[PDB]
């Protein structure tokens, strides 16, 4: 009958105490006929009861999409606890169980390197400010940019890439008007990862 997909929290949400990390259990292909969907949640096998189901919404293909959101403690996810979502529905021979947890392996600290634009790029009105982050593990990481204390938002970051030593790397590219760079403005690449002190570091870049 229905299918289940279990999603982890965003890397930033488990690293910053200001955020509230959530695990999301998504059920699709729930029929009109058998619409009842029951969720059971366990952390390392112990059932938990703070899960909240969101309003379901019928889909363009005439099935129900039902979602249960489970808030989790930052420490538990980081310390490897297993989150299991149990979904019960009448169209199933049996309940479907999906499990997720942080990747295993010793965490490795990211090295953060800011790189100015290539001189060849100065012929354009916009330049690229680059932030290379390498040697980190697990691949869960968050990267942002700011200037003067405010958030530079015109950036894009590549997904993590597995390196030859088993760690990961990525590049974040912030695009700014060439004038802003030429004027001496200072930019900062902020990186959040479990293996960094305070789960946070910043590296500046300026002319």
């Amino acid at each position: 009958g229905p299918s289940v997909f279990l999603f982890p929290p965003k890397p930033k949400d488990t690293l910053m105490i200001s955020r509230t990390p959530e695990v999301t259990c998504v059920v699709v292909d729930v029929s009109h006929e058998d619409p009842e969907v029951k969720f059971n949640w366990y952390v390392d096998g112990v059932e938990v009861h703070n899960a909240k189901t969101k309003p379901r919404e019928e889909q363009y293909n005439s099935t129900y999409r039902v979602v249960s959101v489970l808030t989790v403690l930052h420490q538990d996810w980081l310390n490897g606890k297993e989150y299991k979502c149990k979904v019960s529905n009448k169209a199933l021979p049996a309940p479907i169980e999906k499990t997720i947890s942080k990747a295993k392996g010793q965490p490795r600290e990211p090295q953060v390197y800011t790189l100015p634009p290539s001189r060849d790029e100065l012929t354009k009105n916009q330049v690229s400010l680059t932030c290379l982050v390498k040697g980190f593990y697990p691949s869960d990481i968050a990267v942002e940019w700011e200037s003067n204390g405010q958030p530079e938002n015109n950036y894009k970051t590549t997904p993590p890439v597995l390196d030859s030593d088993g760690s990961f790397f990525l590049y974040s590219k912030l695009t700014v008007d060439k004038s802003r760079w030429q004027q001496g403005n200072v930019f900062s690449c902020s990186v959040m990862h479990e293996a960094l002190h305070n789960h946070y570091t910043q590296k500046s870049l300026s002319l």
């Binding site: 930052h74 420490q75 789960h199």
Partner: protein, 34 residues
């Protein structure tokens, strides 16, 4: 975000003199009062 709170969070998460219950208690207090 408040960096002070983040520092206290990280410190409590890695304090070796705490067991799971105490770590959880300390982190929750840091979470609510800042």
């Amino acid at each position: 975000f408040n960096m002070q709170c983040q520092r206290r969070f990280y410190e409590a998460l890695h304090d070796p003199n705490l067991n799971e219950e105490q770590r959880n208690a300390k982190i929750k207090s840091i979470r609510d009062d800042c």
